[PDB]
Symmetry: C4
Subunit: 272 residues, 4 copies
């Protein structure tokens, strides 16, 4: 089969298309990268008909040496990935010393990876370390209700985590480490990539106020489902707040009992 029918190209199409249908990825909003093994891509080598283009990295990462990824392109729309995966996605392989990468497949007509790729790489590095190599996905999208909440809730990790845990029972179990929140920062900068990667050490979800969310996970579905869980809770919260707020909710005691039953250690600071 053609690489377009591969599990990982189909996976990238599914995730980007689902996020598009959720209303989280207007225009080129959002970006998605997936760490692969050589063994995933090697069978499809005869599908690679052009010369690998080289792009240097300003900050090398030796931890990622020789590692292939499939990634969304700069200025590309999640809506279009299903229509032309080769135009909108690329497979890249970081070189031997992590000083740059080669584009191996896709990103046709001189397209390049998302301008956020260096920031994705830094977060991949921190998640590899934090999860002993199990995490493989970084997903950014403009999740609508989470965005709306950033204007009305204290932009504070403990406050925000507690509300999201209250907003759907599964949340504490899905993200016991809570949701990290940064100050508003200029997107595309080194600073925002650094700050995100730091919080990725402590959380699988990071919020960018007035902008969107960053998630990490071992697979596309687990990462998408993580974001979707947080966004569903946020959707419930927006309804409840719009109705004048909570008359009742999940208590700290109930949340602790929940953690205990499911063998997770919830972020203590959100349990007042």
């Amino acid at each position: 089969q053609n690489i377009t029918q591969s599990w990982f190209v189909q996976g990238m199409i599914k995730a980007t298309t689902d996020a598009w249908l959720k209303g989280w990825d207007e225009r080129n909003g959002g970006n998605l990268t997936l760490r692969l093994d050589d063994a995933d891509i090697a069978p499809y080598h005869d599908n690679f008909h052009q010369q690998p283009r080289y792009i240097p990295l300003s900050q090398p990462m030796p931890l990622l040496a020789n590692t292939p990824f499939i990634v969304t392109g700069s200025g590309k729309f999640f809506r279009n990935v299903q229509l032309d995966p080769a135009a909108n996605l690329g497979i890249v392989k970081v070189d031997s010393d992590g000083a740059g990468y080669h584009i191996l497949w896709g990103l046709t007509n001189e397209a390049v990876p998302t301008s956020s790729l260096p920031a994705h790489f830094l977060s991949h590095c921190e998640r590899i370390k934090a999860t002993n190599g199990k995490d493989r996905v970084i997903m950014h999208c403009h999740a609508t209700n989470l965005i709306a909440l950033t204007y009305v809730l204290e932009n504070d990790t403990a406050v925000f985590t507690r509300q999201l845990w209250e907003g759907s029972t599964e949340c504490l179990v899905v993200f016991p480490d809570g949701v990290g929140i940064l100050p508003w920062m200029v997107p595309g900068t080194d600073a925002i990539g650094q700050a995100t990667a730091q919080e990725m050490q402590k959380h699988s979800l990071v919020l960018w106020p007035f902008h969107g969310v960053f998630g990490s996970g071992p697979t596309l579905d687990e990462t998408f489902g993580l974001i979707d869980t947080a966004e569903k809770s946020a959707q419930v919260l927006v309804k409840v707040y719009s109705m004048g707020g909570m008359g009742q909710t999940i208590s700290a005691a109930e949340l602790i009992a929940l953690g205990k039953r499911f063998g997770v250690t919830p972020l203590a600071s959100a349990l007042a």
Copy 2:
């Protein structure tokens, strides 16, 4: 034809897919079980290529002895059922004494039924008794507006039923027995399964505050439609409450007249 094209596998795909598109089943949220007859499955026996795996039940149910079911898997996403029904669904058959069940088809790669299966079984038992064997479906989903309402309405069966009946004219006719509401409880426990099954004696719909809904019915479509009716009313209610509340509504007298016309006996406690 392959069992994937059977009415019941297609039915499970339709229900889980529709619920996914409704936004009720983020991640692995939700679960669905359907009681079958041997005669439904027997024609497809040559599609069963592996050895039935046995799983014991902590609480036996002799009422279900020898009974086959098709069920959603643990940790499986409703979104994916249409893509790979064999990975995400299983057909199980409870053994001769109801002390356990065999997995006959599906749940590939060592998957197991939803961890809520024992609780589904207990509710199936109570609905069989309550409806003289006509009910065959238990459906749990994270119906968004119903969830939101649990934070703002008294979590009380009579209050909640009356509002839902007011929220769409058909509601009293579709669920004259009203909607049972439990206290918040730790999901997955024996306690929540027991309490749900008790309320299933009196209602075809049970709410879990800050979590979701459980419904029972004779067919997938009737059960889905039951939940969808309640959820549509809840959606209307959320809009009305967000606009500052009801200026006018369906009265108790109008609700009683409605019951009389359609030959149903509405839950008296919701008719003040």
Copy 3:
């Protein structure tokens, strides 16, 4: 071709499916009937493989003598029409004296037309008279925002029409005769069918508080678009009201100028 591929069966599938996707037709909510000519159906006669079943009408309508219709079935779900049009739709032909009708095609497994068919017929009669035979469609659905508005706006034709005209500029041009509003009434009764048909003399749209909408038009698309226009305005209004109400809006003067430009005569009572 099979009658399933006919313009009118495809049209019924499109309309019911679109309304389902809009969230207007949970369960069996909604019903749709389309007046045909003999010439539409005659080519497909060899597709009619069973004996026409006769159903008498309590109130005859001689105006409809010998007239064929395609109709949605009782207890049938709009969601399922696309999956099995023959199970969920029927073609009926009223007999020579309008005292009853024969089912000619569809409504398989002893299904019957919507229990609202007599009420549809009465409204068809009044619309034929009001439009000199141009109207051919009666559509009922549970349009969500229109429903929500019935709890918060005076249930009064002039008030409701003015708000809907304000809620989207096209509204006055699409429904210059405004939207008739009934008191809440027990659905399925002779009384509600009579009252609806009376208002159908003056308006192409009729609201049933706490229930839904009835629309009439010359084609499926014009009738659907009429309802969709009103429902879109209602959706805008719900947002605006939820934000605390109008700071500015379309004035009576602007509405009159609009009417004049498009050569329509707007309901004077809504123009204060």
Copy 4:
């Protein structure tokens, strides 16, 4: 291949269908025109089986002499474009002196272009001048949240632009020239077409209070994405306002830093 499979007919189908699914184009609401080159259409000439019909223009535009466009039809529904592109779209070519145009393909059964075509032409002219011929698309739709905001925000370009920039971080970067707002005007008039074209000199987005939006861009996707970006911000804003308003937001300083980083010159009047 048939012209229906051409990039531009497929593009028109995608854009109108996506806008339909967004809920922005009830009934015949909305219209879309795309400026082509002769070279785009010339290969498909054997698909043009009828005689070009001539329609004069009241206001000639010599700037558009000999220029082909593909356009949506008058009274046509965006929903139907995918079902029958030839019925719902047309290819037109303005004549040698810009005094009228010929219909070359489509608009079957005596259909004509959107009655807004002259106004589209005037805006095309101004955008050609403003962008040195790079803009090729004018898109009008009834974007729901933007509409709702026009009732609650000062209908003032600087106020509205600032809120939309605050409502999603990308907005300042996507539309640094802000969003022009007209007074309410009677649609279809010369006056509204003139006023829109004037604002098109200064902005790529123009709002019509209580009605919808007009956008311009070099391609269908960039123009659609421009509107979708503004509409997504508006959706966030509606949620935030419905929750009681902003507790925090993007500051003028942060917005200026954003502009600087991305090399754009933001509308100074929105930066208090």
